[PDB]
């Protein structure tokens, strides 16, 4: 590849700042891009740079470009949760009906919710008893902890996922887990996970 | 602006494909990029303009025409489970700085047999009186599950009105059968409401699902509903307590 990219991936808390990098060895160069990839979805160009310009901004994002040490640099302010994606850096060496696009590999951010009072619990979701499934929800803690998949195939268990009550100002994670088998119950649900020494089990 | 044909596709193995891209923003360069969930993009096909036709950098089964500026459709002559992917199709502009711009995709799955197709079973579970005596808040989990394909939209719908803040639904969906390559699907999704909201029984709380499956075209021998493009649903109201 002609384009590299740095990092691989890196998780950062919401409201901090982060740096990602591009470095290329297409000969000729005519412009660089920067491209915001969410999950499912096409790329979005964030930013298009000439060799004539060191500089580009698009609202929280800002792009710099060194067209002499073949650099570009994509520095994100105050990140939030909805800057998780996949940056993409994309190179042109022409600017004629000839030219062709360079892509980078991408760089993976994770933005994690800063959460100042976890309160680690699992529940139980009362049966539709429309459906058969029986529900437990691990919610509350805080991203450090990692939600492990389950030693059994008649239970599934899905990762933590952040939601958001914007209203509140108030986001949590949890962690849905099911079977439909008599022998699940919520408190042996997340065995397989090792979670926070205070979970508060009802 | 740039458009593609059609979002979802179900088909057999063996049959013949087109996907449709257009744009009538008089662009000349257009692009058809491939990428499976969670992979880099990779290139196909490209086009210089109304008559040209170029292999990208990765090797595929499928064609191109470039018959018009407008139209730069794929082809799949015959489909085999291996071309399951997403396929993008983009045009830069002739102005300015050259700006790319993508198509909404065509998420694409070749089935062995057009009877995997299943569309989901859904249920809505309630919120945990612990949880609201613990928090203040009620938290909804939806379940979408024994889906195939995964060609699946799930939303939240509270008094009609679709809600995004409160939500979170999986990025990607469970295996069944992890070991299956026609393994089905589930999904999980989680709506949070103030426990006031939820205790209010004049509120209406409904989990949606868009499938996409077979259309009237396709055909159906089989005993079972014809696995369609639907909405499968699930409710609950706010409860006294």
């Known amino acids: 590849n002609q384009v590299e990219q740095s990092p691989q991936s890196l998780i950062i808390l919401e409201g901090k700042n982060c740096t990602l990098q591009?470095?290329?060895?297409?000969?000729?160069?005519?412009?660089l891009r920067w491209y915001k990839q969410d999950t499912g979805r096409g790329p979005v160009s964030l930013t298009i740079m000439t060799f004539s310009e060191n500089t580009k901004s698009n609202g929280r994002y800002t792009a710099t470009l060194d067209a002499d040490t073949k650099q570009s640099s994509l520095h994100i302010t105050a990140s939030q949760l909805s800057d998780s994606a996949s940056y993409i850096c994309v190179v042109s060496d022409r600017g004629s009906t000839l030219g062709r696009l360079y892509f980078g590999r991408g760089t993976q951010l994770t933005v994690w919710p800063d959460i100042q009072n976890p309160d680690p619990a699992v529940y139980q979701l009362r049966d539709s008893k429309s459906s058969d499934k029986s529900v437990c929800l691990f919610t509350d803690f805080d991203s450090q902890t990692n939600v492990s998949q389950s030693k059994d195939s008649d239970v599934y268990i899905t990762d933590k996922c952040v939601l958001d009550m914007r209203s509140m100002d108030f986001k949590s994670n949890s962690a849905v887990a099911w079977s439909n088998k008599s022998d699940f119950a919520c408190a042996n649900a997340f065995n397989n996970s090792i979670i926070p020494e205070d979970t508060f089990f009802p | 602006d740039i458009y593609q044909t059609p979002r979802y596709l179900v088909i057999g193995t063996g049959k013949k494909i087109t996907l449709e891209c257009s744009q009538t923003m008089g662009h000349d360069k257009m692009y058809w990029y491939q990428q499976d969930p969670g992979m880099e993009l990779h290139l196909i096909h490209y086009?210089?303009?109304?008559?040209?036709?170029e292999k990208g950098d990765l090797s595929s089964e499928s064609t191109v025409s470039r018959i018009r500026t407008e139209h730069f459709p794929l082809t799949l002559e015959s489909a085999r489970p291996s071309h399951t992917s997403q396929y993008l199709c983009?045009?830069?502009?002739?102005?300015?700085?050259?700006?790319?711009?993508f198509g909404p995709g065509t998420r694409l799955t070749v089935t062995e047999d057009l009877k995997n197709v299943f569309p989901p079973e859904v249920a809505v579970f309630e919120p945990s009186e612990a949880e609201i005596s613990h928090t203040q808040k009620a938290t909804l989990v939806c379940l979408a599950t024994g889906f195939y394909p995964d060609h699946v939209e799930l939303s939240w719908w509270v008094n009609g009105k679709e809600v995004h803040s409160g939500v979170c639904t999986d990025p990607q969906p469970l295996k069944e059968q992890p070991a299956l390559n026609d393994s089905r699907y589930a999904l999980s999704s989680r709506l949070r409401v103030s426990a006031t909201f939820w205790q209010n029984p004049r509120n209406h709380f409904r989990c949606q699902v868009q499938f996409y499956g077979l259309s009237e075209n396709d055909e159906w021998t089989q005993d079972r509903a014809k696995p369609v493009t639907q909405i499968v649903s699930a409710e609950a109201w706010g409860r006294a307590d």
């Open positions: 086009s210089y303009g109304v008559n040209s036709t």
């Open positions: 983009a045009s830069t502009s002739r102005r300015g700085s050259y700006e790319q711009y």
């Open positions: 591009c470095n290329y060895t297409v000969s000729p160069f005519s412009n």
